[PDB]
DNA sequence: CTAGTTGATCTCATATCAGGAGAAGGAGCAGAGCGAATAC
């Protein structure tokens, strides 16, 4: 077995499968858990982020670390096309987990609210869609979830979208986003994501705009003056240092 | 005391005993200095003082006129009477002088080569002490009431800043990131203080009559909210769980960092268990303060009993932290005292007040 | 930068801790004695003690306790160092080879914290589930043992009571239960908690807090048949078990407070109790069919003033003392016809607190000889030390000696002494001051429970008999003594600085300097001088008397009228406690400003502050090594050498040398115990060590430094404590590495390693050259 | 003409109160926040703007 | 039962002076009236 800093053990057979960067990601995820802070697994598409999350959760439940003993009831919000993908990966990698889908397809065949209640009181993994999180925000946030992993969490990029406001109602500190492209149009998206995972680091949206978005963006235009380019460089370096501990982005 | 020396020589008592007993005796014999003077350079009241944590030689003082004076407290002359001469000065002619009152000045911990100063001109300036030039400036949308660097952090170098905004700013002196803020207060944050014990624990006191302890690494707001009654008057947390019945305008962790002393505008000081914020119900009587800005007060170190020196009108009230018993009033200022800073090496005190004076209190005999 | 060589001439002898158990073997009954840095392992034979090992810890052993985890064949030893190095050690004997393997180690120093008043406390759960340390106020550190660590990871539990007097683990409790006495403004109370390692926090104790005696100072955890605890205070002994509350107030323990205890039986039916006056009592627990019936205390007898004591077997008790010689005594079943059942079997020499010492070339040889004021109230004595191994004579004074000086012309020692009288006043025992050949009392016209009576003893320097004993004024403490001839007259005088001590004040306001002449077997009072404070220190300065009244260092001239006349004063001191001299220069050791290089400019007639150290070191002693090197001892067990640097910055003395001796140096003195190194400064400490400081040359010091680093790479310390950390200058507000000082013990350990280890040391001259160098270094002591 | 003024020392808006002691021909302007106080002579034609004026002038003159 | 097709509906995302009159509030002064407070 692999023994990390304080009390976290991930099983040896599970650990051996993971690559070097994947177990580095598990290390980073548990450092975030110790800090009680969120993060973005920014590893590009295909590098393996479902596996890193599954391994980290398996080691968290396995380690019996100290409300919740080990792993509590977690909710995984992902696009509709990959819900059963998450189910398959969980079953193959850590079969002990109970992994239910909150969706019309689903497996429950009763009232959904009963399913959320069962997973909350059984410390299972509830995989749901972003549409359901928007729709069932009344029920989804009454149960004190432990982990709120958002797969392809760049869907939260619009700070004013109903899905974003819904996903930002979870009380837990352990907020994780899996997205190999956590910036798609501008820095407002980065602010929205970092407001989700760690509300404070990048300040209020007006402040983030004035301090980072206008300097960094305006220095990228073709007609940028050299002084303005250097100002954009300074702001970009500041932002990179600011977001370094909570963004883990490995390339291919 | 010859008993103390004899016990130390004979090994009956640990030298710790003599050291702390004599420190306490010196603090109790605090009096207006017979042979010491401090050079007068501030045109306005001194709002803040800070003796450097290492070697305790140099003292910073920020005045209401915006100048920052750097004094040498050592008696480099051969006489028994000396004046604490001013080594350096951010005067009115300095290109980077604060345009308004300097409200907090703090030496960089772990090294005397840098200090910081925050002003009501909405700036936290970081100064190189050698060249005496601003190494950095952090601008804020609203006036700064207080700031504090962690006296313990070998890892982080965050400056916690409390402005009239309801947000506690955390300015990273490592690559400059002032974007981090803490939400949960509702009015001006009149005092901020890092825990001397825990690296990432910050106590913030705001005009909403609340004191909050934050683990700045954490993503889930404040750790503890201090409550006068500890639960006797319990209500859903929207307006209850107040630390004081007024503005909480001063914070000070005790020397060990296991307790927190909060002074508020309800004419009350309170002592709180720093681990769960429980009120220890130490009385302290009535502690007169009506300051509309942060109130700077300090605690003693290296003594048998811990003392707290609180500005009390135009005086310094010395209290015993864990019993609340009133030791004395140091009475030598002509206007309200704004700050007092304690030299722990020799149990000395330096108080700055609105009368443009820095008065030194030394143990008698 | 300075170059200094410190070496231990005499190892520490005061015992600060003794524990018994099965450490070396499952069958052996071991006695582990902690002298300050030295751990001595003896095997308790049928007669006496057989030393099996003596290891030198890189640390002052503050805690020493034996514990047997489940499945362990023999006891493991937990040692905590004053600098908070914790180690669990095991004894592994491989034939001739003996090894103390470090089973676990770590450092438990909190970065910040008020060190507790009553000192470091270390306890172990009786079932060995954890180690509880009280190092700081308001905290209780816990080192779990069930979780088998090799790093001794610990966690603090916050303790709501901030002034804890004593704490123990209770017996027969399903959970680790601590019972402790604490002081709050309401009084002293005994409270209980149940520590939870899983939740890492206290829980409500088996029985609630109970208000105990005002001076309740000791907690004794009674074993399983009774359970509960016994609280010993100044006036009463109480026993609590939660609903059983027994209490006694034996009048025989009222006279002195009980400071140590030990459990005689495995079931705790009998305990030993030592008081500060040396009395040894037996506290007996009478059982009833089990619960506890009644408590009895009976005075077994008198021993040395016991810091600690341990019952070995067969009525043999090791009384380990810090103030006097340690003892191995026998508890007879029947009295000795004097009301005492205690009989001393053996005495282990202890240079007690070496408050003062003088080097004398007695017998007119070329050999030095240390005469030391050793010990305390009942164990006070003079010790005469020579190289013969070190031969140590003992002259019991039966009163505390304070200062000593040699008057060669008169062939006598002047010794300041102090005895306790209880009532007008009555002596508790016949002391050396009262057993003088002739005696006198001061009749001074200047001034007009238990008390200290101070005397000047004139002691013959051949037979060491008290030729004379001059008693001082009532409530007068003699602080300083100097034998010198002043001015221009030929007579040699004993000049004694005194202070008037009354309970109504914290600092003496009155005192006098008395000049005696010892001639014709009589001590005539030649002169007096009323001064306005305690004369802490005096020295002869170019035929004048340099004294230090409370904060003023002033110079007196001896006139033709045979009286003292002030010539100059210096006032820039908190309290000038220590004075030294070389030429026109004076070195003033201050209580907390730590040094002041003063100069008496004779062309004008006043002092001049040449330089000062502005670091706040609290002093215990001070000395002048060279024209520009100044040795000083801080109360935090550190040595530091200041140097006159090379403007106003010239007034700053530079601390060019730093070192953590681990001993409280009480006195320096130039001299050597023997017939390459420059100078020789012997020093005496509280735990009895005598050390020696010499100045080295630059290249030689560099080479030695290199050897020290090599040995640190090679020699393995007992607790895996790094030597640099152990010798790092340490104070509650400062920590620096050692500089300008060579640890002579470590260098001299270069002889006690095998040749392959020497070659490992000397990988980069040959080993034989360094053997020659270390031999020459050993020659100086 | 406003009666509450921004303090030149602490820059707190409307934190300065002006007291016209006409019987003694003296105007006293005091900041509530930083407790800075200034006293100037006044006439019957004087107003709080004139007292704040004298305060600003005294500050600038003293800061030369 | 039970999956596949059909419509509605929601979210989200893509850039660049020549009035006047009266009623309600607050202000400052004026005095009346009663409690305490020196004081003859
Ligand atoms: N350590 C591994 N061993 C074997 N297969 C892996 C490992 N990590 C990832 N994979 C495979 O790589 C594919 C991509 O991983 P996934 O996490 O689903 O995508 P992304 O990380 O881009 O969200 C998956 O089909 C998964 O089975
Ligand atoms: F491949 Be994606 F980032 F899940
Ligand atoms: Zn102002």
Automatic annotation (TrEMBL), chain D:
It comes from Homo sapiens. GO terms for molecular function: translation elongation factor activity. The keyword rRNA-binding does not apply. Belongs to the ELOF1 family. Keywords: Elongation factor, Metal-binding, Nucleus, Protein biosynthesis, Zinc. Factor involved in transcription-coupled nucleotide excision repair (TC-NER), a mechanism that rapidly removes RNA polymerase II-blocking lesions from the transcribed strand of active genes. Acts as a key adapter required to anchor TC-NER factors to RNA polymerase II: stably positions UVSSA and the DCX(ERCC8) complex (also named CSA complex) on arrested RNA polymerase II, leading to neddylation and activation of the DCX(ERCC8) complex and ubiquitination of RNA polymerase II. It is found in: Nucleus. GO terms for cellular component: nucleus. This is Transcription elongation factor 1 homolog. It comes from the Eukaryota. Coiled coil: none annotated. Zn(2+) binds at residues 7, 10, 31, 34. Transmembrane segments: none annotated. Associates with RNA polymerase II. The gene is ELOF1. The keyword Metal-binding applies.
């Amino acid at each position: 077995d692999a023994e990390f800093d304080e009390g976290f053990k991930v099983p040896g057979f599970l650990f051996k499968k993971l690559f070097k960067y994947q177990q580095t990601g598990v290390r980073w995820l548990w450092e975030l858990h110790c800090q009680q802070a969120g993060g973005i697994l920014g590893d590009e598409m295909g590098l393996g982020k479902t596996i890193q999350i599954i391994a980290f959760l398996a080691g968290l439940s396995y380690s019996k670390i100290r409300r919740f003993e080990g792993l509590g009831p977690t909710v995984i919000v992902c696009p509709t096309t990959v819900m059963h993908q998450w189910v398959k990966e969980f079953h193959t990698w850590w079969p002990p987990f109970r992994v239910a889908i909150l969706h019309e397809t689903g497996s429950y065949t009763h009232k959904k609210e009963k399913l959320i209640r069962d997973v909350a009181h059984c410390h299972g993994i509830l995989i749901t869609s972003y549409s359901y999180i928007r729709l069932m925000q009344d029920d989804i946030s009454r149960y004190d979830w432990h982990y709120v992993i958002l797969d392809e969490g760049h869907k939260i990029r619009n700070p004013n979208a109903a899905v974003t406001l819904a996903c930002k109602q979870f009380r837990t500190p352990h907020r994780i986003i899996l997205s190999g492209s956590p910036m798609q149009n501008n820095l407002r998206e980065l602010w929205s994501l970092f407001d989700f995972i760690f509300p404070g680091k990048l300040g209020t949206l007006p402040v983030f705009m004035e301090q980072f978005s206008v300097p960094i963006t305006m220095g990228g235009y073709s007609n940028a003056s050299p002084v303005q380019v250097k100002t954009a460089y300074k702001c970009a370096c500041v932002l990179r240092d600011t977001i370094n501990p909570y963004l883990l982005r490995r390339m291919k | 005391m010859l008993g103390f020396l004899s016990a130390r020589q004979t090994g009956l008592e640990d030298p710790l005993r003599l050291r702390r007993a004599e420190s306490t005796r010196r603090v109790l014999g605090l009096e207006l200095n017979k042979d010491r003077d401090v050079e007068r350079i501030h045109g306005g009241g001194i709002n803040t003082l800070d003796i450097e944590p290492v070697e305790g030689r140099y003292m910073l003082s920020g005045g209401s006129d915006g100048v920052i004076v750097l004094y040498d407290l050592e008696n480099s002359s051969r006489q028994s009477y000396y004046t604490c001469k001013a080594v350096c000065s951010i005067g009115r002619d300095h290109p980077d002088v604060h345009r308004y009152s300097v409200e907090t000045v703090q030496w960089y911990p772990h090294d005397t080569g840098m200090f910081t100063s925050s002003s009501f001109d909405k700036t936290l300036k970081v100064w190189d002490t050698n060249t005496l030039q601003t190494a950095d400036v952090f601008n804020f949308e609203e006036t700064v009431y207080s700031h504090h660097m962690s006296p313990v952090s070998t890892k982080h170098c965050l400056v916690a800043v409390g402005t009239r905004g309801p947000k506690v700013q955390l300015c990273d002196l490592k690559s400059g990131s002032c974007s981090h803020i803490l939400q949960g207060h509702r009015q001006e944050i009149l005092a901020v203080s890092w825990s001397p014990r825990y690296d990432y624990i910050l106590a913030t006191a705001s005009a909403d009559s609340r004191v909050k302890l934050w683990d700045v690494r954490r993503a889930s707001g404040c750790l503890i909210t201090l409550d006068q009654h500890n639960g006797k008057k319990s209500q859903a947390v929207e307006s209850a769980n107040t630390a004081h019945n007024g503005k909480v305008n001063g914070l000070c962790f005790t020397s060990d960092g296991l307790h927190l002393l909060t002074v508020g505008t309800d004419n009350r000081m309170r002592l709180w268990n720093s681990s769960n914020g429980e009120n220890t119900l130490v009385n302290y009587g009535k502690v007169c303060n009506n300051s509309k800005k942060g109130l700077k007060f300090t605690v003693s170190c290296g003594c048998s009993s811990e003392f707290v020196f609180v500005p009390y009108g135009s005086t310094i009230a010395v209290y015993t932290v864990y019993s609340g018993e009133q030791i004395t009033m140091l009475k030598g200022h002509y206007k309200t005292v704004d700050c007092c800073v304690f030299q722990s090496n020799f149990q000395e005190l330096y108080s700055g007040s609105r009368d443009c004076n820095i008065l030194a209190w030394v143990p008698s005999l | 930068m300075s170059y200094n060589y410190v070496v231990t001439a005499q190892k520490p002898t005061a015992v600060n801790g003794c524990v018994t158990g099965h450490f070396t073997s499952a069958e052996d009954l071991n006695l582990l004695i902690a002298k300050n840095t030295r751990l001595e392992i003896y095997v308790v034979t049928a007669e006496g003690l057989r030393p099996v090992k003596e290891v030198g810890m890189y640390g002052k052993i503050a805690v020493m306790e034996l514990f047997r985890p489940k499945g362990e064949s023999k006891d493991l030893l937990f040692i905590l160092t004053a600098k908070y190095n914790a180690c669990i050690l095991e004894y592994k004997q491989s034939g001739e080879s003996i090894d103390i393997i470090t089973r676990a180690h770590g450092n438990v120093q909190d970065r910040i914290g008020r060190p507790s008043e009553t000192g470091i406390i270390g306890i172990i759960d009786p079932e060995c589930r954890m180690i509880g340390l009280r190092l700081y106020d308001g905290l209780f550190k816990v080192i779990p043992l069930d979780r088998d660590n090799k790093e001794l990871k610990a966690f603090n539990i916050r303790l709501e009571e901030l002034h804890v007097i004593d704490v123990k683990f209770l017996y027969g409790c399903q959970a680790p239960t601590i019972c402790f006495v604490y002081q709050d403004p309401q009084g002293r109370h005994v409270k209980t908690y149940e520590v939870s390692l899983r939740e890492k926090e206290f829980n409500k104790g088996p029985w609630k807090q109970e208000n105990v005696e005002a001076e309740a100072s000791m907690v004794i955890a009674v074993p399983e048949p009774f359970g509960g605890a016994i609280i010993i205070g100044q006036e009463s002994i109480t026993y609590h078990n939660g609903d059983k509350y027994l209490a006694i107030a034996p009048p025989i323990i009222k006279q002195s407070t009980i400071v140590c205890h030990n459990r005689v039986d495995p079931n705790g039916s009998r305990y030993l109790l030592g008081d500060m006056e040396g009395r040894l009592f037996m506290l007996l627990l009478e059982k009833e069919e089990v619960t506890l019936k009644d408590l009895r205390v009976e005075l077994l007898g008198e021993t040395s003033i016991a810091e600690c004591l341990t019952y070995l077997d067969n009525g043999v008790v090791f009384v380990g003392s810090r103030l006097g010689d340690s003892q191995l005594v026998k508890l007879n079943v029947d009295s000795n016809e004097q009301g005492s059942y205690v009989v001393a079997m053996e005495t282990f020499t202890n240079l007690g607190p070496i408050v003062d010492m003088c080097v004398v070339d007695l017998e007119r040889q070329g050999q030095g000889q240390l005469v030391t004021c050793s010990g305390a109230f009942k164990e006070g004595s003079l010790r005469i030390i020579r190289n013969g191994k070190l031969h140590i004579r003992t002259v019991p004074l039966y009163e505390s000696p304070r200062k000593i000086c040699y008057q060669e012309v008169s062939q006598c020692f002047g010794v300041l002494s102090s005895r306790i009288e209880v009532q007008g006043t009555t002596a508790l025992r016949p002391s050396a001051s009262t057993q003088a050949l002739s005696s006198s009392v001061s009749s001074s016209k200047l001034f007009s429970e238990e008390v200290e009576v101070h005397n000047l003893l004139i002691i013959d320097q051949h037979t060491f008999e008290v030729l004379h004993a001059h008693q001082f004024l009532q409530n007068e403490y003699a602080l300083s003594l100097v034998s010198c001839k002043l001015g221009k007259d030929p007579n040699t005088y004993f000049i004694v600085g005194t202070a008037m001590v009354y309970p109504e004040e914290a600092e003496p306001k009155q005192g006098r300097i008395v000049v005696f002449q010892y001639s014709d077997g009589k001590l005539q009072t030649v002169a007096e001088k009323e001064v306005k404070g305690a004369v802490y220190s005096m020295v002869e300065f170019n035929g004048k008397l340099l004294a230090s009244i409370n904060s003023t260092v002033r110079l007196y001239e001896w006139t033709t009228e045979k009286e003292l006349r002030t010539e100059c004063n210096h006032y820039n001191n908190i309290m000038a406690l220590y004075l030294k001299t070389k030429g026109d220069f004076i070195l003033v050791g201050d209580l907390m400003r730590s040094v002041l290089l003063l100069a008496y400019k004779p062309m004008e007639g006043n002092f001049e502050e040449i330089a000062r150290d502005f670091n706040p070191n609290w002093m215990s002693a001070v000395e002048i090594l060279d024209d520009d090197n100044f040795l000083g001892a801080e109360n935090a067990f550190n040595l530091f050498v200041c140097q006159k640097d090379s403007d106003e910055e010239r007034q700053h003395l530079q601390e060019v040398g730093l070192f953590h001796l681990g001993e409280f140096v009480n006195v320096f003195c130039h001299g050597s115990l023997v017939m390459p190194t420059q100078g020789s400064v012997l020093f005496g400490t509280v735990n009895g060590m005598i050390g020696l400081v010499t100045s080295l040359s630059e290249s030689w010091y560099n080479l030695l430094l290199d050897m020290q680093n090599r040995l640190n790479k090679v020699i393995k310390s007992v607790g895996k404590i790094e030597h640099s950390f152990w010798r790092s200058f340490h104070t509650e507000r400062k920590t620096e590495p050692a500089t300008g000082f060579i640890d002579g013990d470590l260098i001299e350990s270069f002889l006690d390693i095998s040749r392959p280890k020497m070659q490992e040391v000397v990988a980069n001259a040959t080993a034989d050259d360094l053997i020659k160098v270390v031999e020459e270094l050993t020659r100086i002591h | 003409l406003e009666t509450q003024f921004t303090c030149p020392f602490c820059n707190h808006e409307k934190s300065c109160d002006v007291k016209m002691d006409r019987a003694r021909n003296t105007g006293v302007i005091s900041c509530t926040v930083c407790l800075e106080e200034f006293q100037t002579p006044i006439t019957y034609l004087s107003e709080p703007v004139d007292v704040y004026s004298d305060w600003i002038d005294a500050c600038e003159a003293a800061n030369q």
